[PDB]
Each structure stands twice: as structure tokens, then as C-alpha cells.
Amino acid sequence: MPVAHVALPVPLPRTFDYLLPEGMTVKAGCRVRVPFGKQQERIGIVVSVSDASELPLNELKAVVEVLDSEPVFTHSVWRLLLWAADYYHHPIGDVLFHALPILLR
Amino acid sequence: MPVAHVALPVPLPRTFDYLLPEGMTVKAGCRVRVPFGKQQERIGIVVSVSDASELPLNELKAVVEVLDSEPVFTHSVWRLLLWAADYYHHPIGDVLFHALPILL
């Protein structure tokens, strides 16, 4: 009766909002360490950065650390990754994290 | 800037939770109208009906109405559609909603 799990029509790449503490600076295509779960760690890839989110800034968890000074990916590779993710209906995190090992190695 | 839209190798069934109403019995495959953030109504499809939430059963956004008594999708189209999503890497959300029209 309680909790019901629903599926809702979401915006193209369903991303996760993290807050950037004062003094921290990131650009697209870079990796960061972020919180996940009431107390766990994990690695991600910034896809974009704006000045808004669905929830108030003060609610977003804060990015723990940036791993990449510059994009780990190439400018051309990156633009494509995002494109194929959008065009063929694949989760953006799914593509990126899968293609990183392939592309680097 | 402030917010960072990060991508994560998130699980397969990324869904949202909404407390089911009293005397309101719904099952998987049925469309349901639920509040969407700071705002008003919007249609959604129930994938699962647990008894456990990630957040407290106090500050959980509730449900509204059950637009269907019987699952618009068949135990057959259902099985199939969830397989599609999982085998070809497509968000359940997207396969289900995009599929509904064609179905009707």
C-alpha cells in the first residue's frame, strides 16, 4: 500500500544535480567525486552546469571533488557521446562511463 | 556556476515514489496522476508497488487518482517492454510512455 514506484516522462538526459561549494570550478566533460546514498561515494561526469535546478540550491548535495582539470574526453568524441545518447535513447551516464574505458584504452 | 548536472551509472529502474491512498488499490502497468515538484498534476505509470521507501513515509509526496483499474499493458507487452529497456539500454520511462500510443 505505502510506496509506489512510478515512471515519469523525464527530460532527455536524466542527470543528477550537485552543488558546487564556493570556490570550486568545473567544465563539461570532467569527472568529479560526489555523494550517493545517505553516506556513500561515487564517480561522475559533469554533462552541463547552469544557475538553476529543480530543487533549491541549499538542498543539493555538494560536489566532493573534481578529478579532471580538463575534459578526459576529446571535444569531438564528447560532442558525439552526448549526441548518440540523445538520438538513440540511451542514458547519458550509461554511454559515457561505458565509452571511457573503450576510448582511453 | 552553482549547480552541476552530473551523470551517474545509475541502476536500471530509476523511478519516483508516491504514497498510495487509502482504499485506492493500484498495480503495475496502470497510469497514475502525481504531483510534480513545486507545482500541480502530471500523468505517470506505476512500475512497482512496494512497502518500502528511500525517504520517510511522512515527507513523501502522495498520489492523486488511479486512471486505470486494469493495466493498459499486458503481462505480455509488459514483460517484453521491460526486456527491451534492459537489453537495449533504454530508460523504462521512455520505452513505456513512447510505447503506449502505438499500443492504443
Tab-separated table of C-alpha atoms in Angstrom:
chain	number	residue	atom	x	y	z
A	1	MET	CA	0.000	0.000	0.000
A	2	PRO	CA	2.668	2.553	1.092
A	3	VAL	CA	5.399	3.256	-1.562
A	4	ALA	CA	4.709	3.177	-5.305
A	5	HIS	CA	7.330	3.306	-7.787
A	6	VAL	CA	6.487	5.315	-10.873
A	7	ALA	CA	7.856	6.068	-14.137
A	8	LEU	CA	7.582	9.632	-15.362
A	9	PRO	CA	8.281	11.297	-18.737
A	10	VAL	CA	11.656	12.905	-17.997
A	11	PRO	CA	13.871	15.452	-19.810
A	12	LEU	CA	16.344	13.990	-22.366
A	13	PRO	CA	19.362	13.103	-20.264
A	14	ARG	CA	18.165	12.386	-16.707
A	15	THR	CA	21.058	13.895	-14.764
A	16	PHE	CA	21.883	14.382	-11.081
A	17	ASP	CA	22.163	17.869	-9.519
A	18	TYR	CA	25.093	18.537	-7.220
A	19	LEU	CA	26.004	21.895	-5.717
A	20	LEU	CA	29.420	23.382	-6.216
A	21	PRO	CA	30.767	24.955	-2.988
A	22	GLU	CA	32.088	28.499	-3.180
A	23	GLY	CA	35.472	28.463	-4.918
A	24	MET	CA	35.063	25.186	-6.789
A	25	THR	CA	35.095	25.460	-10.728
A	26	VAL	CA	34.124	22.676	-13.282
A	27	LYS	CA	33.616	22.384	-17.009
A	28	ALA	CA	31.723	19.829	-19.013
A	29	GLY	CA	33.333	16.515	-19.748
A	30	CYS	CA	35.144	16.356	-16.408
A	31	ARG	CA	34.968	13.838	-13.614
A	32	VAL	CA	34.046	14.573	-10.019
A	33	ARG	CA	33.603	12.634	-6.815
A	34	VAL	CA	30.051	13.007	-5.427
A	35	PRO	CA	27.924	11.735	-2.533
A	36	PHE	CA	25.387	8.963	-3.220
A	37	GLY	CA	23.260	7.272	-0.599
A	38	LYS	CA	22.888	8.634	2.937
A	39	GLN	CA	26.695	8.262	3.198
A	40	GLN	CA	28.391	6.702	0.136
A	41	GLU	CA	30.936	7.876	-2.533
A	42	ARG	CA	30.979	7.575	-6.372
A	43	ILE	CA	32.482	8.967	-9.611
A	44	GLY	CA	30.629	11.006	-12.157
A	45	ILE	CA	30.928	13.095	-15.258
A	46	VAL	CA	29.611	16.643	-15.454
A	47	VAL	CA	27.486	16.970	-18.586
A	48	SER	CA	26.497	20.617	-18.017
A	49	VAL	CA	26.493	23.470	-15.489
A	50	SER	CA	23.851	26.165	-15.081
A	51	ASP	CA	22.463	28.564	-12.477
A	52	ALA	CA	19.304	26.590	-11.586
A	53	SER	CA	17.982	23.177	-10.533
A	54	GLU	CA	14.658	21.630	-9.710
A	55	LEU	CA	15.397	21.790	-6.011
A	56	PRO	CA	16.757	24.752	-4.038
A	57	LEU	CA	20.495	25.147	-4.071
A	58	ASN	CA	20.616	24.623	-0.323
A	59	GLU	CA	19.100	21.149	-0.855
A	60	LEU	CA	21.559	19.811	-3.445
A	61	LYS	CA	24.417	17.793	-2.000
A	62	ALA	CA	27.783	19.355	-2.644
A	63	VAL	CA	30.368	18.037	-5.076
A	64	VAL	CA	33.219	16.500	-3.106
A	65	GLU	CA	35.947	16.834	-5.645
A	66	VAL	CA	36.798	17.430	-9.261
A	67	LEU	CA	39.103	14.816	-10.772
A	68	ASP	CA	39.784	16.478	-14.084
A	69	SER	CA	41.445	19.798	-14.703
A	70	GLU	CA	40.343	19.407	-18.319
A	71	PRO	CA	37.953	17.064	-20.219
A	72	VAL	CA	39.094	13.445	-20.075
A	73	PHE	CA	37.319	13.065	-23.385
A	74	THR	CA	38.132	14.830	-26.679
A	75	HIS	CA	35.989	17.726	-27.843
A	76	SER	CA	34.760	15.765	-30.889
A	77	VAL	CA	34.273	12.455	-29.060
A	78	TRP	CA	32.410	14.258	-26.328
A	79	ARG	CA	30.012	16.121	-28.597
A	80	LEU	CA	29.168	12.779	-30.194
A	81	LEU	CA	28.750	10.817	-26.966
A	82	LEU	CA	26.072	13.297	-25.912
A	83	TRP	CA	24.529	13.173	-29.382
A	84	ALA	CA	24.209	9.382	-29.641
A	85	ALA	CA	22.911	9.303	-26.092
A	86	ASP	CA	20.142	11.657	-27.101
A	87	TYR	CA	19.415	10.373	-30.592
A	88	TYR	CA	19.217	6.615	-29.797
A	89	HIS	CA	17.556	6.984	-26.425
A	90	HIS	CA	20.387	5.783	-24.151
A	91	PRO	CA	21.069	7.014	-20.656
A	92	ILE	CA	23.907	9.579	-20.861
A	93	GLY	CA	25.683	8.093	-17.863
A	94	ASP	CA	25.382	4.678	-19.497
A	95	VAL	CA	27.132	5.782	-22.701
A	96	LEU	CA	29.869	7.961	-21.141
A	97	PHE	CA	31.036	5.565	-18.477
A	98	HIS	CA	30.952	2.666	-20.959
A	99	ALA	CA	32.881	4.517	-23.721
A	100	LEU	CA	35.542	5.932	-21.382
A	101	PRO	CA	37.338	2.560	-20.970
A	102	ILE	CA	36.998	1.921	-24.698
A	103	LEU	CA	38.224	5.383	-25.798
A	104	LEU	CA	41.136	5.726	-23.333
A	105	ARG	CA	42.413	2.201	-23.651
B	1	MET	CA	28.338	28.312	-11.858
B	2	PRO	CA	26.391	26.770	-8.888
B	3	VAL	CA	24.595	23.603	-9.945
B	4	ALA	CA	26.322	20.751	-11.685
B	5	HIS	CA	24.362	18.254	-13.751
B	6	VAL	CA	26.365	15.117	-13.216
B	7	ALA	CA	25.830	11.822	-14.969
B	8	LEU	CA	25.949	8.632	-12.963
B	9	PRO	CA	25.991	4.927	-13.947
B	10	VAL	CA	22.654	4.766	-12.152
B	11	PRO	CA	20.720	1.447	-11.732
B	12	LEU	CA	18.094	0.276	-14.201
B	13	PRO	CA	14.636	1.218	-12.756
B	14	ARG	CA	15.065	4.905	-11.919
B	15	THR	CA	11.564	5.808	-10.725
B	16	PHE	CA	9.888	8.227	-8.300
B	17	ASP	CA	7.887	7.405	-5.143
B	18	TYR	CA	4.338	8.441	-4.191
B	19	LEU	CA	2.350	7.203	-1.147
B	20	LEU	CA	-0.694	5.225	-2.338
B	21	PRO	CA	-4.101	6.490	-0.999
B	22	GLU	CA	-6.414	4.582	1.348
B	23	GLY	CA	-8.953	2.382	-0.435
B	24	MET	CA	-7.070	3.251	-3.618
B	25	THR	CA	-5.746	-0.079	-4.974
B	26	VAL	CA	-3.398	0.147	-7.982
B	27	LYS	CA	-0.979	-2.234	-9.669
B	28	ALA	CA	1.907	-2.130	-12.173
B	29	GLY	CA	1.223	-1.008	-15.710
B	30	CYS	CA	-1.505	1.466	-14.625
B	31	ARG	CA	-1.275	5.201	-15.328
B	32	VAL	CA	-1.493	7.441	-12.263
B	33	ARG	CA	-1.648	11.206	-11.797
B	34	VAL	CA	1.011	12.520	-9.415
B	35	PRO	CA	2.269	15.893	-8.167
B	36	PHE	CA	5.462	17.024	-9.857
B	37	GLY	CA	7.607	19.154	-7.546
B	38	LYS	CA	6.669	22.742	-6.708
B	39	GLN	CA	3.527	22.736	-8.761
B	40	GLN	CA	0.441	20.713	-9.889
B	41	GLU	CA	-0.589	17.358	-11.528
B	42	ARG	CA	1.034	15.205	-14.278
B	43	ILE	CA	0.494	11.641	-15.594
B	44	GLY	CA	2.746	8.682	-14.699
B	45	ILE	CA	2.945	4.888	-14.945
B	46	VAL	CA	3.282	2.577	-11.924
B	47	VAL	CA	6.159	0.135	-12.352
B	48	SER	CA	6.226	-1.289	-8.828
B	49	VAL	CA	4.185	-1.177	-5.645
B	50	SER	CA	6.492	-1.799	-2.677
B	51	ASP	CA	6.048	-1.256	1.064
B	52	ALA	CA	9.433	0.425	1.427
B	53	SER	CA	10.631	3.923	0.503
B	54	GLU	CA	14.090	5.542	0.329
B	55	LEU	CA	12.686	8.513	2.348
B	56	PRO	CA	10.314	8.715	5.396
B	57	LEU	CA	6.643	7.768	4.912
B	58	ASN	CA	5.866	11.209	6.318
B	59	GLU	CA	7.522	13.631	3.877
B	60	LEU	CA	6.673	11.531	0.823
B	61	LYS	CA	4.743	13.208	-2.000
B	62	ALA	CA	1.368	11.451	-2.174
B	63	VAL	CA	-0.632	10.161	-5.122
B	64	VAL	CA	-3.833	11.546	-6.611
B	65	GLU	CA	-6.120	9.269	-8.643
B	66	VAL	CA	-5.918	5.927	-10.447
B	67	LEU	CA	-6.826	6.454	-14.096
B	68	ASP	CA	-6.935	2.687	-14.635
B	69	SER	CA	-8.269	-0.319	-12.731
B	70	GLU	CA	-6.653	-2.734	-15.157
B	71	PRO	CA	-3.070	-2.469	-16.586
B	72	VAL	CA	-3.095	-0.859	-20.029
B	73	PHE	CA	-0.106	-3.107	-20.790
B	74	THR	CA	-0.407	-6.927	-20.911
B	75	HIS	CA	1.655	-9.356	-18.830
B	76	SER	CA	2.976	-9.940	-22.367
B	77	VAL	CA	3.679	-6.417	-23.640
B	78	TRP	CA	4.916	-5.628	-20.090
B	79	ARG	CA	7.484	-8.442	-19.892
B	80	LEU	CA	8.526	-7.552	-23.466
B	81	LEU	CA	8.831	-3.796	-22.900
B	82	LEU	CA	10.913	-4.130	-19.742
B	83	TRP	CA	13.141	-6.560	-21.582
B	84	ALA	CA	13.564	-4.115	-24.443
B	85	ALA	CA	14.604	-1.385	-22.000
B	86	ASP	CA	17.058	-3.595	-20.219
B	87	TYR	CA	18.557	-5.385	-23.240
B	88	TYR	CA	18.896	-2.332	-25.479
B	89	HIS	CA	19.701	0.196	-22.710
B	90	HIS	CA	16.648	2.462	-22.813
B	91	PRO	CA	15.101	4.199	-19.761
B	92	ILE	CA	11.974	2.285	-18.642
B	93	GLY	CA	10.222	5.608	-18.534
B	94	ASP	CA	10.826	6.310	-22.192
B	95	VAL	CA	10.070	2.809	-23.591
B	96	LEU	CA	6.749	2.631	-21.641
B	97	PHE	CA	5.479	6.104	-22.430
B	98	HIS	CA	6.676	6.096	-26.012
B	99	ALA	CA	5.154	2.658	-26.430
B	100	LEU	CA	1.704	3.484	-25.008
B	101	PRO	CA	0.468	5.496	-28.046
B	102	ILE	CA	1.362	2.795	-30.599
B	103	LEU	CA	-0.368	0.350	-28.253
B	104	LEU	CA	-3.600	2.342	-28.419
